[model samples]
Target: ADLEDNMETLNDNLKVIEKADNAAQVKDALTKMRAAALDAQKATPPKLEDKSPDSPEMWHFRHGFDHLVGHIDDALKLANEGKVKEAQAAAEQLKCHCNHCHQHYR
Candidate 1:
């Protein structure tokens, strides 16, 4: 349930990022999104009958999240530097990871 909530928060933040018209708004949204992503990364995956703790499922989950964090960090940096276009591009990359994870794991 916590993980679900975190994902939902991330989705909401993404919407904010998408609609942002200024660097300040983008920076704020990226901050929130980064927090949500970090929380989700630290969370334990819910029990799955097909995947044990030691399975590749866990590896993929962690790897995808780490990749997301890196992209979010890059976006945040770009936004902080007043490069909104580059920040948006980085956010788009982050969204790709989110979609990929959802397609495979959810």
Candidate 2:
């Protein structure tokens, strides 16, 4: 339930980002999305203790989330600086992280 809620929040914020007409709007959307990503990270399942191949995959899964956070932060920074193109690039990178993880794990 928690995961679903967070994912919904993230999706909604992403939609806002996509529809934003100005940097301020994008910044606001990214800010909210970043918070949602952090919350989702906290709710992530615990890593396995066994020395199994899946353990490493799980580690990388968490790592991908961390990257998403970083990319979102980068987008926020660019937006704050009024660099629309750069901000959009960062946002696209953030989406790429989501797609990569979903393709591999979802």
Candidate 3:
């Protein structure tokens, strides 16, 4: 799927994380989040469509997804420690800054 579809799926998984009752639910959401993110990496954002696949802009586009996985992994670590709320707080970065910034700049 495209980056748009992937991000929508990621956003849905975020809600699942925020609403989770236990670490199991976080793990479930993480499964899909990681999958969607890795899938999204191969996609070229519409804004970067004019650039070559190997161009700096395209690399930067994929880089965002890379960092996203870092956050996802960190959240997963917290969840494993039975810290769902703190894990959710870690994931909150996506909504607060990255998502909104992309809407404006992507």
Candidate 4:
């Protein structure tokens, strides 16, 4: 699978989750996005392996994705509890991670 395409799909999934107004919808979208992310990671070109610490590719891109996903998960949890402000903050963190990775990689 193409890296660019995978990234775009991730962005699209995130947008869907972000726009969701209800806990159930957010959770459903998150589950789909998580599955898509796993598929994307599995389909990623093996030739694009990360190198040493100094290598840009090795500078926590995957970790950033994980962080973003975690934030979204937290947001969903907060949504379930009706904590809108906290959920929004979590969403903001997720967006920050996405923006940071996009700046670094794309």
Candidate 5:
């Protein structure tokens, strides 16, 4: 999916656990969640399109997305271990990250 479409996909996948009854359901959604998280980071946002990849702004942007990936991975780990509540907690953390980071890009 394109970078712009990732947010909706991310949001939808993140909520999959709401109806999930098994590890695989959560795992499937998280797989897409992590993919979208990483893919969205692959390009500079229009707001920062002029910045060099090594610039402080770009580094912060990249690192912020990296953190999102880490959070998703942590959630996935919990899902794989069949710890649904903990996995949901980890996934919930991403909402905070998204709100804080999205303003810069938006």
Candidate 6:
């Protein structure tokens, strides 16, 4: 697939992870999204179309994607240990990353 198509797929899978209700579901989806993202990255360089800090869309594509995936990993770990509040807090940051990125990019 092309870079745009791959990115959209990554974003779509991320949305699924974001909407997941349980730790297991979040973990599963996060894993899938992260793998897809890595695959996409392997397929393309961080060029103008893939990841360029100068471009608003690329900013979201870079920072937002990393932030959410990282936060989700943390959240999933916490949630698995039954630390609901901590997990939720991490999830909140994940959301903040999304909102902030969208505010600037979209």
Clashing pairs in 2: none
Task: For residue 14, give model 5's deviation from the true position in Å.
Answer: 1.8
Quote the lDDT for 58 in model 3. 75
> Which 10 consecutive positions of candidate 1 have the poorest summed lDDT?
44-53
TM value for model 1: 0.85
Clashing pairs in 6: none
Runs of candidate 2 exceeding 4 Å displacement:
44-54
Candidate 2 lDDT at 54 equals 55
TM-score of each: 0.85, 0.78, 0.81, 0.61, 0.85, 0.47
Best by lDDT: 5
Of candidate 6, the 10-residue stretch with the lowest lDDT total is: 40-49
Model 1 per-residue lDDT tens digits across residues 5-41: 8898899889878887775777888888777877877
- For candidate 3, lDDT tens digit of each residue in 1-106? 8878888888899888788877688778877898898998888777777889888777777787788888788888887888877877887765653674386437
What would the per-residue lDDT of candidate 4 be over residues 4-106, giving only the tens digit for each residue?
A: 6766766776676667676456556656555555555443234435455445574465666576667667777887788765665566456666678667655
Query: Which regions of candidate 5 are displaced past 4 Å?
Result: 19-23
For each predicted model, how many residue pairs clash, with residues at least 3 apart or on different chains? 0, 0, 0, 0, 0, 0
| Candidate models: Cα lDDT each | 0.79, 0.74, 0.78, 0.61, 0.81, 0.59
**Candidate 5 has what TM-score?**
0.85
User: In angstroms, what RMSD does candidate 3 have relative to the true structure?
Assistant: 2.2
For all predictions, the C-alpha RMSD in Å is: 2.0, 3.5, 2.2, 3.9, 1.8, 5.0
Q: Candidate 5: which pairs clash? A: none
The lDDT of model 2 is 0.74
lDDT score for candidate 4 against the true structure = 0.61
